[PDB]
Amino acid sequence: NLKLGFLVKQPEEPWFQTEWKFADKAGKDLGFEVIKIAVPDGEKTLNAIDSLAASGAKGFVICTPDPKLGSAIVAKARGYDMKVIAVDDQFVNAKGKPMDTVPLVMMAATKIGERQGQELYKEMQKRGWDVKESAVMAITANELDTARRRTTGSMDALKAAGFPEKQIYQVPTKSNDIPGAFDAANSMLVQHPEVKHWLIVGMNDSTVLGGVRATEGQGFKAADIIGIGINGVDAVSELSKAQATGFYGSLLPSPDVHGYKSSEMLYNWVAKDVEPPKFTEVTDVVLITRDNFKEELEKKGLGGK
């Protein structure tokens, strides 16, 4: 044999490499081979399905590079008698409305974004920054629902703790990566010279990291910057550095659970026509910082660091 695909939009992120590793484990346990394909754009996405069909795969797990390709992915898979489960990014129709009929495995995005804002606030308090010279830089990808629900949950948590609404600045990024976030943050930074300390809000580690690299390029030292990412496994190189930076820590969800559990449920669907729940929300989360990242990853089975 049974072949299943595991398609991810960004193979460069440790987040997806970890889903790939745990899907392989599910394969070993249940007796199936996992075909690992990178689908960074819509065209590679449709061509990879064709490719899956030529290898005899019976279904695939996918994290789409664009939620709007949902209809087409479903259409091509139905054509090849393949089942599909989405992992992390939900499929939406042309109008941006959720395609509720494709089983989805994903993190509790709002809750994790809210924890990000609660932890930003906490560290800010511990540093004693004066709120009057502080501000939040929120790097958003609003067209991606999962991303939007994390950055909105984070801004909402900050506003709820008392961070002044008018000191929250949003800036859209063109790409969910360091270069995109960098660009975005750099453009906001020169517009606010009055700010002496920044909170950086981003849906994932790469976005917060681009934001931190920009603050360093504008003269901010690490004590005046607080950024907390989301993914965990993606921030290990940052947290491993000799010196501390404005990247304080990351919220470690469960990519191991997403890789193994979406592969297992696919397998059960394809091999026993056992229908997966439509929605699996994983609430797992732990704050990893320079002080505990090695222990927390080893405790989750993601050894090395």
Ligand X SMILES: C[C@H]1O[C@H](O)[C@H](O)[C@@H](O)[C@H]1O
Distance CA 228, CA 213 (A): 13
User: How far apart, in Å, are the Cα atoms of 102 and each of 20, 46, 60, 250?
Assistant: 20, 17, 12, 30
Contact 172, 88 (CB under 8 A): no
Asked if residue 230 binds ligand X (CB under 6 A), the reply is yes
- Which one of 231, 250, 262, 263 is in contact with ligand X (CB under 6 A)? 231
**Would you say 73 or 189 has its CB closer to ligand X?**
73
- Which one of 140, 204, 245, 254 is in contact with ligand X (CB under 6 A)? 204
233's CB contacts (< 8 A; 6+ apart) are 14, 15, 17, 18, 252, 255, 297, 302
Report the nearest approach of ligand X to the CB of residue 51 (Å).
22
Report the nearest approach of ligand X to the CB of residue 89 (Å).
5
Q: Find the binding residues for ligand X in span 117-136 (CB under 6 A).
A: none
- Which one of 6, 37, 52, 89 is in contact with ligand X (CB under 6 A)? 89
Question: Residue 15 has which token pair?
Answer: 């987040």
Contact 98, 91 (CB under 8 A): yes
**Would you say 90 or 134 has its CB closer to ligand X?**
90
Q: Find the binding residues for ligand X in span 134-163 (CB under 6 A).
A: 146
Q: Find the binding residues for ligand X in span 238-257 (CB under 6 A).
A: none
Distance CA 212, CA 202 (A): 11
- Which one of 90, 176, 215, 245 is in contact with ligand X (CB under 6 A)? 176
Report the nearest approach of ligand X to the CB of residue 148 (Å).
11
Report the nearest approach of ligand X to the CB of residue 246 (Å).
20
Q: 234: which DSSP letter? A: G
The helix or strand, by DSSP H or E, that contains position 106, with its residue range, turns out to be strand 104-107
- The number of residues that bind ligand X (CB under 6 A) is 11
Torsion of CA 200, 186, 189, 178, to 10 degrees: 0
Contact 19, 258 (CB under 8 A): yes
Report the nearest approach of ligand X to the CB of residue 63 (Å).
6
**Would you say 88 or 256 has its CB closer to ligand X?**
88
Q: Find the binding residues for ligand X in span 11-70 (CB under 6 A).
A: 13, 15, 63
Sheet holding 247-252, edge to edge: 168-172, 134-140, 197-201, 225-230, 247-252, 286-289
- Which one of 88, 119, 256, 264 is in contact with ligand X (CB under 6 A)? 88
Residue at shortest CB range from ligand X: 204
Torsion of CA 258, 261, 265, 266, to 10 degrees: 50
Report the nearest approach of ligand X to the CB of residue 13 (Å).
5
Report the nearest approach of ligand X to the CB of residue 268 (Å).
23
Binding site for ligand X (CB under 6 A): 13, 15, 63, 88-89, 107, 146, 176, 204, 230-231
